[PDB]
Design a protein around this ligand. Structure first.
Ligand SMILES: CC(C)=CCN(C(=O)N(C)[C@H]1CC[C@H](c2ccncc2)CC1)c1cccc(NC(=O)c2ccccc2)c1
Ligand code: NA
Length: 259
């Protein structure tokens, strides 16, 4: 691959991200003064654990749906076999969501945009997973200190997804080739924009892995307490990704075959 091709991959990735970023950055920035009042915070804290879990699962499912479309438009992704497309999304869709989330996080007051306004960690106290919430806020706080541009988020989240080390890949060498090209595009862009200083400050892969593992652990705790809530009121795509034995849902298969 030559230089003009690396730059074409840079613009192709940024275009696929812009078309699938879910929320406009300007919309998120303009709403920073719109913060939940103490009464609205109390209202969220008074909601039942199962209602807050349901609402968060819905917002999570919607964010994952945009990540799936990002993948479908990502150069090289649809060339991979369907098994590998599903392996990469099952392991990586949530990690992409957690990175994208830093756009909706305000490090000045430690709040995140949620259901129309900004609120702190205390907004989510009814979930009963305070340790995971604090880890998510800490992760978004760490990414916010980097002051990512939109192009940087695009190239970085493409690499989060195209990981040739995910277990279960059948065409590992093909994913390796795509990952190498996307790394070149990412690094070429950082070199051109004099932003290579962020490479040492990107979080280690173990941080994203720990966040996703905590998600599975806290979901199993909740599913034990409210199994009918999960079965009847959680979205099917959410259950295919995090719950078990819920992998029986074909949702990802159908989202990839549409368009
Ligand atoms: C703090 C909190 C809970 C926030 C609620 N929530 C949420 O706001 N999401 C999905 C945002 C994800 C980012 C998305 C975005 C932002 C900016 N630009 C583009 C896209 C907006 C929606 C969220 C976010 C990350 C993870 C979770 N986790 C769960 O629901 C869960 C917890 C335990 C077990 C299983 C699942 C929930
Ligand atoms: Na931010």
């Amino acid at each position: 691959a030559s230089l003009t091709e690396i730059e074409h991959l840079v613009q192709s990735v940024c275009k696929s991200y812009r078309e699938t970023c879910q929320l406009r950055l300007e919309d998120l920035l303009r709403q920073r003064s719109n913060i939940f009042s103490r009464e609205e915070v109390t209202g969220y804290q008074r909601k039942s654990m199962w209602e807050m879990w349901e609402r968060c699962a819905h917002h999570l499912t919607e964010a994952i749906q945009y990540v799936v479309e990002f993948a479908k438009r990502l150069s090289g992704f649809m060339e991979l076999c369907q098994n590998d497309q599903i392996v990469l999304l099952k392991a990586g869709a949530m990690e992409v969501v957690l990175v994208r989330m830093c756009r909706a996080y305000n490090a000045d007051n430690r709040t995140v945009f949620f259901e129309g306004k900004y609120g702190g960690m205390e907004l989510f106290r009814a979930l009963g997973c305070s340790e995971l919430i604090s880890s998510i806020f800490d992760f978004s706080h760490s990414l916010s200190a980097l002051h990512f541009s939109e192009d940087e988020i695009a190239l970085y989240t493409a690499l989060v997804l195209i990981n040739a080390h995910r277990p279960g890949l059948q065409e590992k060498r093909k994913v390796e080739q795509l990952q190498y090209n996307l790394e070149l595009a990412f690094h070429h862009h950082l070199c051109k924009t004099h932003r290579q200083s962020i490479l040492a400050k990107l979080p280690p892969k173990g941080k994203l892995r720990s966040l996703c593992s905590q998600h599975v652990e806290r979901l199993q705790i909740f599913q034990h307490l409210h199994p009918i809530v999960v079965q009847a009121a959680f979205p099917p795509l959410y259950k295919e990704l995090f719950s078990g034995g819920g992998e029986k849902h074909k949702i990802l298969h159908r989202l990839l075959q549409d368009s």
